[PDB]
Enzyme design. Sequence first.
Site, short mmCIF file in Angstrom:
data_model
loop_
_atom_site.label_atom_id
_atom_site.label_comp_id
_atom_site.label_asym_id
_atom_site.label_seq_id
_atom_site.Cartn_x
_atom_site.Cartn_y
_atom_site.Cartn_z
N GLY A 155 0.82 -1.45 -0.26
CA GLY A 155 0.45 0.07 -0.18
C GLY A 155 0.73 1.01 -0.23
N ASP A 198 4.71 9.10 -11.52
CA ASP A 198 5.29 8.01 -10.76
C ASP A 198 6.02 7.25 -11.11
OD1 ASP A 198 4.66 7.50 -7.91
OD2 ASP A 198 2.83 6.74 -8.70
N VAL A 258 -3.63 -2.42 -1.27
CA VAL A 258 -3.68 -3.82 -2.16
C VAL A 258 -3.55 -4.92 -1.46
CG1 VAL A 258 -2.74 -4.67 -4.59
CG2 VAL A 258 -2.64 -2.85 -4.11
C1 LIG Z 1 1.64 2.89 -7.38
N1 LIG Z 1 1.35 1.29 -7.41
C2 LIG Z 1 2.35 0.40 -6.86
N2 LIG Z 1 2.03 -0.79 -6.62
C3 LIG Z 1 0.53 -0.63 -6.74
C4 LIG Z 1 -0.25 -1.33 -7.64
C5 LIG Z 1 0.56 -2.96 -7.10
C6 LIG Z 1 1.05 -3.85 -5.69
N3 LIG Z 1 0.90 -4.96 -5.29
C7 LIG Z 1 0.69 -5.29 -6.67
N4 LIG Z 1 1.33 -6.91 -6.51
C8 LIG Z 1 1.67 -7.51 -5.90
C9 LIG Z 1 2.50 -6.79 -5.01
C10 LIG Z 1 4.26 -8.02 -3.91
C11 LIG Z 1 4.32 -9.23 -4.24
N5 LIG Z 1 5.36 -9.43 -3.68
C12 LIG Z 1 5.94 -10.78 -4.39
C13 LIG Z 1 6.90 -11.70 -3.24
O1 LIG Z 1 7.78 -10.72 -2.78
C14 LIG Z 1 6.66 -9.02 -2.03
C15 LIG Z 1 6.30 -8.89 -2.89
C16 LIG Z 1 3.54 -9.39 -5.07
C17 LIG Z 1 2.24 -9.01 -6.10
C18 LIG Z 1 -0.09 -4.97 -7.54
C19 LIG Z 1 -1.01 -6.37 -8.65
N6 LIG Z 1 -1.49 -6.17 -9.70
O2 LIG Z 1 -0.75 -7.30 -8.68
N7 LIG Z 1 -0.84 -4.26 -7.39
C20 LIG Z 1 -1.57 -1.99 -7.91
C21 LIG Z 1 -1.59 -0.05 -7.83
C22 LIG Z 1 -1.10 0.70 -7.92
C23 LIG Z 1 0.35 0.36 -7.56
#
Ligand code: A1ITC
Length: 287
Positions: free
Chosen positions: A19, A131, A25
């Site tokens: 987040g 961003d 998320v």
């Molecule tokens: C500005 N901003 C930045 N991020 C987003 C997201 C966002 C963030 N995380 C996501 N997924 C995700 C995160 C962490 C991990 N782990 C894997 C194993 O190691 C540790 C981390 C796996 C999947 C996704 C997605 N779509 O799957 N989206 C969404 C919208 C805006 C955003």
Amino acid sequence: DIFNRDPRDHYDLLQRLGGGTYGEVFKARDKVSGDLVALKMVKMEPDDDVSTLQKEILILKTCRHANIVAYHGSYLWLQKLWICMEFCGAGSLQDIYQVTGSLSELQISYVCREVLQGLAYLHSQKKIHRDIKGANILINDAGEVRLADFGISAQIGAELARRLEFIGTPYWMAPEVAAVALKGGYNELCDIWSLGITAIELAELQPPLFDVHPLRVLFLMTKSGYQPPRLKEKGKWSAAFHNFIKVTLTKSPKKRPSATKMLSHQLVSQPGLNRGLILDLLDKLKN
Ligand SMILES: Cn1cnc2c(-c3cnc(Nc4ccc(N5CCOCC5)cc4)c(C(N)=O)n3)cccc21
């Protein structure tokens, strides 16, 4: 387009993925198909009216590109907007490099080509991402590279905090953006500078000046004599990588190349750049 129901009716909420100013998320599973998705929840305020929500949701649904996380649908329930989107199994490049260590020059080249393809699309649609950074570039299990969203303009709910966040963390912003609240303004070419900073971040595990207080960075970066950043180890990197950093980090936006122009740069137009390079990177996670 926007369901009037609890997303829990259609999805089993699993772990919190992360987040920030953009929202929270969660990883989720479709109750019927079993497919995984990501759900981003944002808290709605008394000013977030449904007419504005409807307008922004149509843009979320029409802004489609292979290098941008695909939008699936949305739910508005108990003053919380939930955006359903494609699940990127490996998380962000920051989540990856905080395990694997620095990316190779070829891995960085492929990521930069993929991000430039996304940016060229967004810029042709008269959008400015504003961003770009490693934490905002996601990777799926197939090694595909996708921008998490189309930038600060994709924010529905808490938009101002997200728009101003760089003031407390300005490391990825071009000098013309860092000159915030002054007469200048900026254009889509600020994304090119941010991509250059991001390429340094993937090579060094942090952007230039990351240890310097954000207010000192804003001050230095906008001074007349500011020298744009460079990679710290000249010998580890090729002349093409050093040149890519030199041109993306051009101080004047009137001299900085466009995303379409950058796509023909030697670093990103070279042969052998493909998802296999990121599959090799994801194999490093296992050890
Ligand atoms: C500005 N901003 C930045 N991020 C987003 C997201 C966002 C963030 N995380 C996501 N997924 C995700 C995160 C962490 C991990 N782990 C894997 C194993 O190691 C540790 C981390 C796996 C999947 C996704 C997605 N779509 O799957 N989206 C969404 C919208 C805006 C955003």
